[PDB]
Swiss-Prot record:
Residues forming the catalytic site: E460
Natural source organism: Saccharomyces cerevisiae (strain ATCC 204508 / S288c)
Intrachain disulfide bonds: none
GO cellular component: cytoplasm; nucleus
Name assigned to this protein: Probable dipeptidyl peptidase 3
Swiss-Prot/TrEMBL cofactor(s): Zn(2+)
Molecular function per GO: aminopeptidase activity; dipeptidyl-peptidase activity; metal ion binding; metalloexopeptidase activity
Similarity field: Belongs to the peptidase M49 family.
Residues binding Zn(2+), per UniProt: H459, H464, E516
Keywords for this protein: Aminopeptidase, Cytoplasm, Hydrolase, Metal-binding, Metalloprotease, Protease, Zinc
EC number: 3.4.14.4
The reaction(s) this protein catalyses: Release of an N-terminal dipeptide from a peptide comprising four or more residues, with broad specificity. Also acts on dipeptidyl 2-naphthylamides
Additional note from the record: Present with 3260 molecules/cell in log phase SD medium.
């Protein structure tokens, strides 16, 4: 593996300005605005938590750009190449808010020559011997930053930016030769963090998520608390000054005011958004967040979360703070992150319409009422559009809070991030989607997104929502035990779920991919339904057939891309959704009534191919092989036929020699980790919230952050 930044990384502008944002009321826009400002105010916080050089590098990047007036070297074509490489590093750095990638926790360095990097200083007239401290905003409290670890800017470039050591290039315990920005001073050991967890935090009932550890001695620690306050204003919970643990040796002192500058900014913006909250619960929630970032009380954040869980299906969903605790070695301290996601209000309405008509579509599904619930119970499913996500990496969904006591007692939120999931399937880059023929590029590029959304909604509502397991209870069955439902062969099934037995227990690990497949096939099945399309806003036959075509084409492609997550050595799948999609693509190709429904045209060098899917066969062969696959999956699952069901699905998901031969090709067409650019909001002369977007380029990413500094 290499330690270089990505080249030709795909950049996605998280656009919500044209379609989604305009749907929000004025109040909702203002709320979204200030929560976004609060989110971005924590950018530097994340950096300080990724690596010690991260913030300094950020400052240097800003300094260079400023002193060069945004004009980078472009004389010789070599200078152009070196500039591009430099900007690609900057872009990836900004995408991860630091120089250790969130996906892998490994340090990455620029591809441009170090000599060139230092030439940027020459051009910008930045004295390489000066201290990085001179590059920081004057109101950043350097007592809690890492600039001092680098005597000169030259050292920052050499050691911070470029230097690589196998161990040091990985997040972990500094005592073991690794890197961690959660720890400062002397090398922090696992024993240290084990002791602090039990004999300090647990002992004093103090949640550790918003802290950093400064080891000032072999047995002396400082606990830096993230807060605007520079003093302890919560002595009822936090000890004042130095204390000694139970071992009468270890000394610990809580020091407040870490990230004070940013905490103050975050709190000020939360206060603004509070004026525009949608209900009293959101207002109270914000107050606790404010108490949390101002005072440093970690309990206040938990109090915010308890209120948050009680805020049902808001139009503007948010969550902020030191949330996930996996990047810190001992796994108890959280990395800052902040989310602002908005409803697609039109989509929410369409989904409601789908629910209101659910029973009708359920009946249309290819099985007897014997394998269906008498009354439809709509599953819980939330899809939102990311407007802002400040953090080391933007997830495809969120499942929080992480406080086990709150999750159990009050509940938790599970939210899917639409425009993030959509990007993974869209496969947007600096030119055509892999394996899509030129002939299909137009329609695919135009309808892929729409078909994807339609399929997701059906998948989640009617897909997972449908079905009844033939089950035994302590005193009776939910089916006619004497004359059980008929199987696919027309004979009464002899299988069922005995008392205590569940889908998961009976089908074991196969249950995951199997059910995801069933849900996916249900979506494909109903994709061609006239009223379904009407509900989703496709009323004319021409656009309908295009959505359908794009849906089948996208599924075929997805099943082939899935080969990446199949291990040719062990034959085991790495992701349930991938195995399911593959089985469906394989169904099109090998189990249709017409062999020419799905074909793969290899190029002359057998290192690339084009998907040939016959649109005119979708109505017949296409629909029938999907309906066929669905009937088997559903009856097998519901009748508890683990024996037939397993063999059936395992076979359909088995990578045949011909398809296995394509894996290398699939791997070669893999796009690098996607980098997301976030909009910037502001209030105009007319007191109107306005969104500013940016080009999907390294310069665009850079600009999006420049516009956030001042
Ligand atoms: Mg039916
Ligand atoms: Mg049978
Ligand atoms: Zn699913």
């Amino acid at each position: 593996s290499h330690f270089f930044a990505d080249h030709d990384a795909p950049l996605s502008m998280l656009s919500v300005k044209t379609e989604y944002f305009p749907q929000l009321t004025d109040k909702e826009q203002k709320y979204a605005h200030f929560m976004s400002k609060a989110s971005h105010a924590g950018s530097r916080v994340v950096m300080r938590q990724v690596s010690h050089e991260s913030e300094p590098i950020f400052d240097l990047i800003l300094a260079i750009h400023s002193k060069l007036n945004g004009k980078y070297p472009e004389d010789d074509i070599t200078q152009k190449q070196q500039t591009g490489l430099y900007l690609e590093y900057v872009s990836q750095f900004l995408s991860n808010l630091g120089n250790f990638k969130s996906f892998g926790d490994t340090k990455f360095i620029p591809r441009c020559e170090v000599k060139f990097f230092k030439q940027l200083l020459e051009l910008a007239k930045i004295n390489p011997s000066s201290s990085p401290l001179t590059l920081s905003p004057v109101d950043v409290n350097h007592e809690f930053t890492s600039h001092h670890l680098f005597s000169t800017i030259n050292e920052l470039i050499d050691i911070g930016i470029y230097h690589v050591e196998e161990k040091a290039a990985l997040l972990g315990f500094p005592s073991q030769g690794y890197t961690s920005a959660y720890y400062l001073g002397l090398p922090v050991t696992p024993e240290d963090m084990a002791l602090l967890k039990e004999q300090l935090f647990a002992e004093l009932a103090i949640l550790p998520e918003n802290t950093r550890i400064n080891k000032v001695g072999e047995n002396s620690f400082q606990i830096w608390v993230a807060s605007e306050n520079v003093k302890n204003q919560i002595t009822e919970t936090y000890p004042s000054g130095q204390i000694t643990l139970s071992n009468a040796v270890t000394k610990v002192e809580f020091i407040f005011g870490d990230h004070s500058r940013e905490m103050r900014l975050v709190a000020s913006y939360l206060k603004e958004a509070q004026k525009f909250a949608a209900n009293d619960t959101q207002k109270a929630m914000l107050q606790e967040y404010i108490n949390h970032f101002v005072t440093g009380s970690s309990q206040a954040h938990k109090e915010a979360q308890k209120l948050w869980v009680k805020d049902i299906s808001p139009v503007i969903e948010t969550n902020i703070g030191f949330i996930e605790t996996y990047r810190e070695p001992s796994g108890i301290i959280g990395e800052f992150e902040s989310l602002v996601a908005i409803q697609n209000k039109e989509r929410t309405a369409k989904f409601s319409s789908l629910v209101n008509n659910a029973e009708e579509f359920i009946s249309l599904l290819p099985w007897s009422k014997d394998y269906e619930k008498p009354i439809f119970n709509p599953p819980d499913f939330t899809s939102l559009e990311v407007l802002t996500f400040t953090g080391s990496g933007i997830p495809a969904g969120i499942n929080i809070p992480n406080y086990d006591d709150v999750r159990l007692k009050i509940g938790f939120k599970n939210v899917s991030l639409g425009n993030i999931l959509s990007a993974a399937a869209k496969s947007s880059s600096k030119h055509p989607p892999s394996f899509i023929s030129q002939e299909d590029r137009p329609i695919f590029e135009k309808y892929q997104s729409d078909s994807f959304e339609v399929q997701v909604d059906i998948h989640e509502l009617l897909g997972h929502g449908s079905g009844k397991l033939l089950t035994e209870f302590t005193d009776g069955f939910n089916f006619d035990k004497e004359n059980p439902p008929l199987g696919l062969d027309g004979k009464p099934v002899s299988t069922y779920y005995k008392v205590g037995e569940t889908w998961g227990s009976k089908f074991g690990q196969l249950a995951g991919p199997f059910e995801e497949c069933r849900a996916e096939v249900i979506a494909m099945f109903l994709l061609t339904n006239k009223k379904i399309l009407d509900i989703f806003g496709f009323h004319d036959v021409e656009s309908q057939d295009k959505v359908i075509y794009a849906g089948y084409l996208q599924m075929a492609r997805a099943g082939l891309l899935a080969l990446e997550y199949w291990n040719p050595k062990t034959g085991k799948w790495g992701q349930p959704h991938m195995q399911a999609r593959f089985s469906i693509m394989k169904t099109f190709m090998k189990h249709s009534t017409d062999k020419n429904f799905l074909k793969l045209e290899m190029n002359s060098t057998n290192d690339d191919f084009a998907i040939k899917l016959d649109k005119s066969l979708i109505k017949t062969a296409g629909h029938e092989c999907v309906k066929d696959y669905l009937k088997h999956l559903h009856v097998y699952k519901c009748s508890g036929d683990v024996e037939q069901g397993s063999k059936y699905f395992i076979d359909r998901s088995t990578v045949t020699p011909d398809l296995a031969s394509l894996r290398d090709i699939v791997l070669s067409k893999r796009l690098p980790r996607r980098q997301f650019i976030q909009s910037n909001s502001y209030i105009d002369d007319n007191n109107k919230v306005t969104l500013k977007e940016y080009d999907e380029t390294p310069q665009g990413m850079l600009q999006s952050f420049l516009d956030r500094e001042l």
